[PDB]
């Protein structure tokens, strides 16, 4: 009746432990899945156009500080001053500005001028770097139409076009500097579902979007995410009022944690970047770049004065970070700090890392401040030096800093396991994981902390090279066509696989109108086709009729090459010859090989329409419909 | 992840033996016990047999109708069960299952299909239906075996089309009809492969 | 002594709508242990059984959670929050404490709610040739009927009827049904009708030649 | 001394957009930023918990609030604060 | 040897499907846990405070 | 044929780091049905004992994540990633094959791991006042110790010394012992060196009154 | 909820008998096998006793040490169990728990300490621990029955201040003693409110 319970609640609950044991794996994954990166952009003084412009620069210790701009219109004969305390002037002349900024390409999304010079110049710069960032990651822009992607980003207004303006404009100015408009305007020219954030939260106003992004990215409200930041400054204002706090080091370089900090120095920057979960990533295949481990944000609140920061919030946040990640001190190795160069936050900084990083340390951490490199890159600043970490990650090395003369003497230097990055050293890996950390503290008081991970290690497949293959390129422009066609010969030069350059161009790219082929069969014969082009045809389609002629067109060895060449086409005619083997008399693979008199109708006749028929099935091969 | 595999199946003759071979990956097969149940075609779920394991002895029970005819064996280190048709009948014609679990079958196979008949190939018979003054149609019958298909106007009909599944017969042969209402260029296609008979036809009052 | 369930036999569902189907024993499946011994299947159309609801309450994972059960003692019920459309299929409640476990029983057919739809009847005559061949059938016709339970009766008849039914619509969410009576030739010249009852029908309607 | 988090929507309006007199440096960037207003209201009452101002067209303070909800679920904070703010110092939109 | 874990295993079982079971609609809450609305305060144009 | 299972008897931990306890057994545990009979209990101090993880690798519900336990056979681990403040107690890992059980043997003890700290010994003569009752007892007083293992002798013995050790200390994280030699008035008087081994200690230390 | 009262101790000369009830609540008591398990002071954990569930026959097993001594009842309407111990002795003084499930002890009660002496109430005696040349400290003595509270300085005298728990002399009186430790006036009271006795002294070379 019940004697054989045993059995039967033994199967029953052992199928209750493995359901629930599942269960609980997956709570603990959907709170705290890690999100992995499969795409940067950047753009920074310097003709930095890409990460590895960058990261070269970071290698080999270059500055970019320059003059201020005149292009803006800026009056800086009135600016300009020894003296500090005259109003309306500025006592420093130099900083890292982004002279690049006004250029902008509105056909490309056919918007009319009007519109460009109404536009603020943030949005331009936004919808580029998103769709480089978007070309990075190997994906269509195209095929995102539809989908429920998301979007956020930080910005802060800048009061361009505040003057009077000719009527000719109206109707324009208004979206032109509506900051909401901005992330929503991206969505409207690629048609995406997902939310439309713009937040501002001063310098930390990117960090904290990637925050969020990663919240909901956790909740399934999307598939995948972009944030990034943007800093463009219309009015040289800031520079003036910063002037009377006397804050601003009259060498506009930022010295930061050495002896000799006098002050900090402004620049301009964008920067954008593409989130996803790790295991959908896996999933789809797509190149992982680096996984974001950790996140925490918090909030200054009451201290000393209105901007004044604390040591203890900055520690709080850091181990709700650590905490969130679940990940010990010990665990991280290398920290990119604010490094402002400010000679009161600095001290207060720094003793917050010793007392929270410098307690029991296997080895001396380090810590870097790119600013010191391009100054306070103020929104995008955050984003940007993430990005220089996960270069630092991908080339194996630690990249020094800059005008590092002797460590401040505020500091005990020897109360914990703390040094700086003077020189660049090998960070190789070693079996054990790495990991960084990023911080950020804006001046209203929110302050954010961020600690990523080193991608996991990859296996690479070996595939062989082909004979001879097609490469393919489109442009919304012939002037853009013959540019990509430049840059793509120039990459060329290179040493590269000619069979996945081909793959890649046929599978991470889109189509457009503007179009150029070119067949090659060596990286040399490439390069002269690619210098060699000059014609491209922006025809449009009428309807296709495949004609066919009638005798006169076999000659000798009509079907040898392409029969070796093409398996397909080859499994055609062997189908054709069985099919009409009941009449022949002679092997019409010899004779279409040409090892038989082709000049007798009976045997020509059936060759050529055999050689029809493959043709015909070798153009259906390639999707084409009569 | 768990995953079962089924092979063996077919068309047999009355009277014949076949075996059927169930493959389990991705779990410790040595520790649950399988069972195999069918499902005859229209016709609800009846067990059939199940086999313990090595922690209990792993005994084999089988049901009275086919009693003594199929048997039942596993192999711990391939993790594979083999089940063996003995005395086979056309009634036991159906699709078979074998799932994890003595009594709880929380997890199922593809299936397969078997099949018991003495009959050969046939060529389908197409026949007319046709109104007298809202409906028309063609009756595919005395075909053998299954699948035959039937497209109306080379599938240009397609409104009002039914086409009810195919009968076996009392004669061991199948049968169906499409049916197209079409009230106030009539076409019904029948394709068969095991035969390989195409026949088009018309139906006109 | 040999235990057995009852479910209702099939229950009609709107998309969107909470949904409970009860079960009743004939004994109770509470043990000494403390637990009731009744299981909850699930077959989709023309897919392999998959298993929802275990010792009544507790539920099995990959389930969506919109299902649920309870119940004890001879008494119990599975619930649905949400009825979706895919959802369609055939639900067993089916008992674990009494060994050994023979048949699933007949179960319960779960199916779209829609409007009631009388039969359109239509009657054919035999093709000619079949009546070459030397036989005839005649074939009687139900379309776009809702719900199921409509029945034929042969007149001129039982034994040589065979009736083909078609699934539940896609789009009119109804049924059709075929019936053909066969005979030989000589029989079908030597006499010279299809009635159909349906709960659609309000009177039964026979087709004839 | 608690974790509350605050979430507040509002536009740009340029108040006192103008020629600034003098003696009011140093109040005027810190009296029109747009992200002090909520690290204000949290150095006036001392909260720890985040403080975040977000931009979203016309529904910018229903956003807010979806926010904030995700943030309770989450644990970061045991209360929470939002809503949503609008005036216009100049009439220049009706012109538009 | 073998004769005390029928027991043994019914324990065991019955205190893993509570205890997981619990774990489970603590998982669901914190999916959808409700919010409450407690402080209120608004200003309106036609005087209202 | 009783099966035994030992541990190594203390771990000194810090907080913020990875312990492992191993647990070895004399015979393998695992069942034919699959599942080894191991459980893991832990009692703070003056706290009642309660459960952790049972069955190899399952945790309670209202436990801390960061504990975890794996192993077969004979031989099992459990786990913590992160070592804190309050985890300090006793630890029992207590087999569950063989019924009934009689005790829970020694288990496992945890301190907070500290730099090695020596006694500081001092001996203490009796009180007159103590005397005058007609008894003298003699302390040999170890102040900040870490860790234990403070072992003592009286020299001048056996039979009349008892030894109480105050818990960890909540700053330094030391122990104190009070170990007491009592003597009668007479026999006191009568005769007129506790040795101390501790491991902070390079040598044993020699107390004279 | 599921939760456990402890109820009935207390202290008791050898050889009487007394009950512990344990009250449940929140859950079904009849399906659980209720255990008692004690521990003596400054010792471990002893397994004492346990009673199965109704389903199983509702037997009792008890220790071998005190076989036919004690006994285990349950009251399952008002699911409250009862040890019965009789002829007790000082051995067993010990703190003592009741633990739902037989086998697994997943939810544990309070506790309850049970003490058996024959002992009389007496104030304590108090005497300095005077140096010579940098601790001091007083030790109290013959003081029973428990608690005895030791103040240094009425608290005003903080570090140092170690209290060593009290040991029980094989008299059955108790005495401890409280140091401190000052390098280079100090006043030291107790009190034993069972013997309602408030002495208080000096240590001074």
Request: proline letters at 5%.
């Amino acid at each position: 009746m019940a004697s054989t319970d045993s059995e039967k609640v033994a199967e029953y609950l052992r199928r209750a432990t493995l359901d629930l044991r599942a269960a609980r794996q997956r709570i603990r994954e959907l709170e705290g899945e890690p999100i992995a990166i499969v795409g940067m952009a950047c753009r920074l003084p310097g003709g930095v156009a890409s990460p590895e412009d960058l990261w070269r620069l970071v290698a080999e210790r270059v500055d970019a500080v320059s003059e201020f701009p005149g292009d803006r219109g800026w009056d800086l004969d009135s600016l300009i001053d020894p003296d500090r305390e005259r109003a309306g002037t500025s006592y420093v002349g130099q900083g890292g500005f982004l002279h690049d900024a006004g250029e902008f390409d509105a056909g490309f999304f056919g918007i009319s001028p009007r519109e460009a010079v109404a536009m603020d110049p943030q949005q331009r710069l936004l919808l580029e770097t998103s769709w480089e960032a978007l070309e990075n990651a190997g994906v269509d822009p195209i095929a995102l139409k539809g989908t429920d992607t998301g979007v956020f980003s930080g910005l802060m207004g800048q009061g361009y076009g505040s003057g009077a303006v000719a009527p000719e404009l109206e109707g324009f100015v208004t979206t032109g500097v509506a900051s909401s408009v901005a992330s929503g305007r991206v969505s409207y020219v690629l048609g995406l579902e997902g939310p439309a954030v713009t937040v501002d939260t001063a310098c930390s106003s990117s960090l904290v979007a990637m925050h969020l992004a990663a919240q909901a990215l956790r909740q399934g409200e999307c598939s995948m995410a972009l944030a990034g930041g943007v800093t463009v400054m219309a009015t040289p204002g800031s520079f003036v009022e910063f002037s009377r706090q006397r804050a601003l080091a009259p060498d506009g370089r930022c010295k930061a944690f050495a002896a000799a900090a006098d002050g900090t120095g402004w620049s301009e920057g964008v920067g954008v970047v593409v989130l996803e979960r790790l295991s959908v990533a896996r999933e789809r295949g797509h190149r992982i770049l680096a996984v974001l481990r950790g996140s925490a944000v918090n909030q200054d609140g009451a201290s000393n004065g209105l901007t004044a920061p604390n040591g203890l919030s900055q520690q709080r946040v850091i181990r709700r970070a650590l905490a969130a990640a679940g990940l010990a001190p010990s665990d991280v190795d290398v920290v990119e700090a604010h490094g402002t160069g400010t000679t009161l936050g600095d001290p207060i900084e720094a003793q917050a890392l010793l007392a929270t990083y410098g307690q029991e340390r296997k080895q001396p951490l380090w810590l870097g401040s790119l600013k010191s490199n391009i100054g306070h890159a103020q929104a995008a600043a955050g984003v940007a030096g993430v990005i220089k970490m996960v270069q630092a990650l991908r080339h194996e090395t630690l990249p020094p800093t800059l005008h590092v003369d002797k460590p401040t003497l505020e500091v005990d230097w020897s109360a914990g396991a703390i040094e700086l990055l003077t020189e660049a050293r090998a960070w190789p890996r070693n079996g054990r994981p790495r990991r960084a950390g990023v911080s950020s503290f804006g001046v209203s008081g929110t302050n954010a902390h961020l600690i990523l991970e080193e991608a996991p290690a990859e296996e690479p497949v070996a595939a062989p090279e082909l004979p001879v293959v097609p490469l393919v390129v489109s442009a919304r422009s012939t002037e853009s066509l013959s540019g990509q066609a430049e840059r793509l010969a120039s990459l060329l030069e290179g040493d590269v696989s000619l069979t996945e350059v081909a793959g890649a161009l046929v599978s991470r790219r889109a189509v457009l109108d503007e179009r150029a082929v070119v067949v090659a069969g060596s990286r040399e014969e490439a390069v002269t086709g690619l210098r060699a082009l000059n014609t491209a045809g922006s025809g449009t389609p009428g309807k296709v009729v495949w004609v066919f002629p009638g005798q006169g067109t076999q000659w000798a060895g009509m079907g040898r090459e392409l029969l070796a060449e093409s398996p397909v086409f080859a499994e055609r005619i062997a189908e054709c010859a069985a099919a009409l083997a009941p009449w022949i008399d002679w092997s019409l693979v010899d004779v279409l090989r040409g090892e038989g008199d082709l000049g007798r109708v009976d045997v020509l006749q059936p060759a050529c329409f055999a050689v029809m028929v493959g043709l015909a099935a070798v153009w259906e091969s390639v999707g084409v419909r009569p | 992840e768990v995953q079962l595999v089924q092979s063996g199946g077919g068309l047999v003759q009355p009277g014949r033996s076949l075996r059927l071979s169930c493959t389990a990956s991705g779990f410790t097969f040595g520790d649950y016990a399988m069972s195999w149940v069918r499902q005859a075609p229209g016709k609800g779920l009846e067990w059939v047999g199940f086999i313990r394991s090595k922690a209990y002895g792993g005994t084999t029970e089988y049901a009275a109708s086919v009693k003594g005819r199929f048997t039942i064996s596993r192999d711990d280190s391939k993790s594979i069960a083999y089940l063996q048709m003995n005395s086979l009948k056309t009634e036991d014609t159906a699709v078979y299952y074998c799932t994890r679990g003595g009594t709880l079958f929380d997890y199922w196979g593809q299936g397969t299909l078997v099949t018991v008949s003495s009959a050969s190939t046939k060529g389908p018979s197409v026949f007319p239906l046709a109104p007298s003054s809202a409906a028309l149609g063609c009756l595919v019958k005395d075909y053998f075996p299954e699948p035959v298909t039937v497209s109306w106007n080379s599938g240009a009909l397609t409104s009002g089309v039914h086409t009810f599944p195919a009968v076996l017969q009392s004669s061991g042969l199948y049968s169906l009809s499409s049916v197209v209402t079409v009230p106030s260029t009539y076409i019904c296609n029948v394709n068969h492969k095991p035969s390989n008979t195409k026949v088009d036809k018309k139906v006109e009052p | 002594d040999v235990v057995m369930t009852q479910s209702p036999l099939s229950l009609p569902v709107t998309p969107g709508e909470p949904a409970s189907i009860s079960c009743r024993s004939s004994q109770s499946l509470l043990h000494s242990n403390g637990y009731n011994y009744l299981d909850w299947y699930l077959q989709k159309p023309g897919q392999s059984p998959q298993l929802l609801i275990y010792l009544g309450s507790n539920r099995a994972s990959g389930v969506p959670d919109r299902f649920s059960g309870s119940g004890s003692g001879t008494d119990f019920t599975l619930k649905i929050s949400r009825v979706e459309a895919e959802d369609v299929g055939v639900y067993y409640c089916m008992q674990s404490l009494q060994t050994p476990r023979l048949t699933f029983g007949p179960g319960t057919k779960v199916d779209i709610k829609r409007t009631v739809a009388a039969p359109s009847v239509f009657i054919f005559p035999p093709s000619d040739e079949q009546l070459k061949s030397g036989t005839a059938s005649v074939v009687c016709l139900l379309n776009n009927f809702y719900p199921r339970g409509a029945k034929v009766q042969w007149k001129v008849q039982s034994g040589n009827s065979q009736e083909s039914v078609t699934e539940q619509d896609s789009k009119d969410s109804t049924y059709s049904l075929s019936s053909t009576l066969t005979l030989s030739k000589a029989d079908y010249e030597k006499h010279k009708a299809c009635e159909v009852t349906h709960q659609g029908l309000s009177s039964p309607v026979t087709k004839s030649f």
